[PDB]
Design a protein around this ligand. Structure first.
Ligand code: CL
Ligand code: CL
Ligand code: CL
Ligand code: CL
Lengths: 225, 225, 225, 225
């Protein structure tokens, strides 16, 4: 509907503006939409995204470690599989179809904007609890969902149709909704039904906001091969 | 064959005697073999093992976080699924078929011997690297493999046939072998082909030995509902 | 006064009965009070407490890592020094005055009851946030404070006067009060003034209760050299 | 002498060129040397360095947690004090003497280059062992030592004399040497006397190299208020 990824995400998104818009309506995203993004920039982004996925997968495994209920653990385990026995292996196939070797991929030098983001999310998770970690992971998961859904409606080229159909597709949208349910359930379990009244709420929104800014930096990196 | 779970395990096992024998030939295990273990002791063990599996699953998720190669991560992810989208949900079914409610299971008070062991393994993993963690996890994985394989050959009752056929069965044996390959590959990657010449080797054997002793304590707990 | 270590501790203590009494009025403690505890049991306890202090010091260093404010960090840093550039080095001197070598001390085999407790506290800290960690550490800090203060008033022998005067003395009592202030301030910062109304509160009391039970196990270990 | 901070640092430094030179002979550093760095850039750097020190202090507390010997722990505890009961409180005094409020300091928005670096070091420490963490911390500690020592000999202005005399002074140089001894001792304990023959050695040099590049980014941030 209006707010397809749960209550907590909708509230965090609203507190993260205007960075959220700068992220989801970034020039890189507009290039994907119109098929005007240069190939070189897309391929650079793919290679860096391969490294990003390694560390993002580790962060989702950390969410399992930080889970308190079997339910939390299963949702996180589900996402680790959605990434490590699916999205990563497909992604390598996409790089490979676009010309990038497997040895060259493995030697990918991680850009600062990439490292900044994944180390931010991992450290948030190690130092805080599951809610800190989910706050840090949400902008990636839900932002790609929102961008994919929009571009499914608005793309004027199929050049980047595979990317768009990945994030706009039912499987990915369902995974976003599942993460939204996890976030809502984790918040309510720990902080109560009125979770926005906890002092923690401001911290969590700040973590989400920081991760949103780091996403903007990742797209800017993508434009600067 | 002789040494079915890889080189590192065979070497650690040999350094962990006589605790290793005290673990794999424990009175609790002999009760399973002969079908003489009392029902009350088995059911108590099942309930505690349900809690143990929660934390052991988290420890295997930690192994993903501590992985350096896609290969390490996939092996660990594989094991988390073997535990969290399989062994845990089956285990609840076994408790449930034996009479234990789902609410009562969720309120299971963790025994000290249980907590000692899982917190030992988790802390080893958080504080050390992947090798520390695998050293701590190996006695559980491979010990159950060795016990199941033996009891498949030696059981004189089918009373505990489901337990025996779980750990003696091809799926579990294959999973043990996979963990053995991971341990060997992780050791060689980090410490080199002559990994027993690293000063780390003695530390890792000590961690494995401690975890073996904690297994002996877990079986002793099982006998003392 | 009545409740000398802050509001949160007083509330957690009350939720941890009757384990709290079993801890602070344990037979080992009564032996210290009356000077009837056997020397062999005291020396065994000292050696195990040397290992305990290593890991407890690491847990207080973890509290620094998990701190959010300069104030939290300074309080934790203060306690790490109170332990690592003071209590540990004095403790070695006490073992040494009682006959135990420095090499034999370093080879101290950690008892299960000891390991259980320190790994419990460390894992709570790594997996949760600062509040989980402080909940787990509080029974050690404040329990020794309460026992030392009582035994200062009630001891009928000076045999264990050094131990009693350590924990009953102004320096240690001041350190207990400082930890109580940290716990109260950390709770209020994260959960608000009405922190007992957070769903987290029950979890934290449970962690504190578990650690109190593990203390009872540590004294029982002490009686069983 | 030639190589004043121990064997391991000298070897890592040599593997990190030319980034090491780009770090220690950065334009920002040349501005400090000649007193030509603009005040605005220096003050921006001070404020960001206040946040950096918070997280760097946490990373040194993590080194305590990851220590295996009392000696390792004491060296790390020593450094946490050198930072948290000394350098941080002095640093606030320096900001304050240069005009920056205490409330405005506390609201310091962390730059991406700052966050990238501290989250990199913390995550390295959480995910790896003490050696990973020290490899990540060494460029900060020893680089400031090398820069301070050089600028003590080569500065043509006293404008930034306080900064130069901090890092060039005997106390800081002694602290650098102490960290060098810790790094050498930790390496030899874990990997043996021939530690450069371990496969780990290449990983550790890479971590150190990455952190050196992140230092270059921090100085570049400093030039871009
Ligand atoms: Cl690239
Ligand atoms: Cl039970
Ligand atoms: Cl002892
Ligand atoms: Cl600034």
């Amino acid at each position: 509907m209006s707010e397809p990824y749960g209550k907590a995400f909708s509230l965090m998104r609203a507190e993260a503006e205007p960075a959220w818009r700068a992220y989801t309506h970034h020039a890189f995203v507009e290039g994907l939409k119109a098929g005007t993004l240069p190939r070189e920039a897309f391929l650079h982004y793919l290679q860096q995204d391969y490294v990003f996925l390694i560390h993002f997968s580790r962060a989702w495994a950390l969410a399992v470690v930080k889970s308190e209920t079997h339910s939390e653990m299963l949702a996180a385990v589900g996402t680790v599989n959605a990434l490590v026995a699916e999205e990563m292996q497909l992604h390598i196939g996409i790089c490979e179809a676009s010309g990038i070797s497997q040895e060259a991929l493995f030697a990918t030098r991680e850009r600062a904007e990439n490292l900044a983001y994944t180390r931010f999310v991992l450290e948030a998770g190690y130092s805080g609890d599951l809610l800190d970690l989910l706050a840090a992971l949400a902008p990636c998961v839900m932002g790609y969902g929102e961008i994919g859904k929009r571009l499914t409606a608005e793309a004027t080229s199929t050049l980047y149709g595979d990317w768009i159909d990945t994030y706009g597709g039912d499987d990915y949208q369902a995974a976003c909704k599942a993460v939204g349910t996890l976030l809502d359930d984790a918040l309510e379990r720990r902080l109560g039904a009125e979770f926005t009244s906890s002092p923690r709420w401001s911290r969590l929104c700040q973590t989400f906001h920081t991760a949103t800014e780091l996403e903007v930096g990742f797209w800017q990196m993508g434009l600067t091969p």
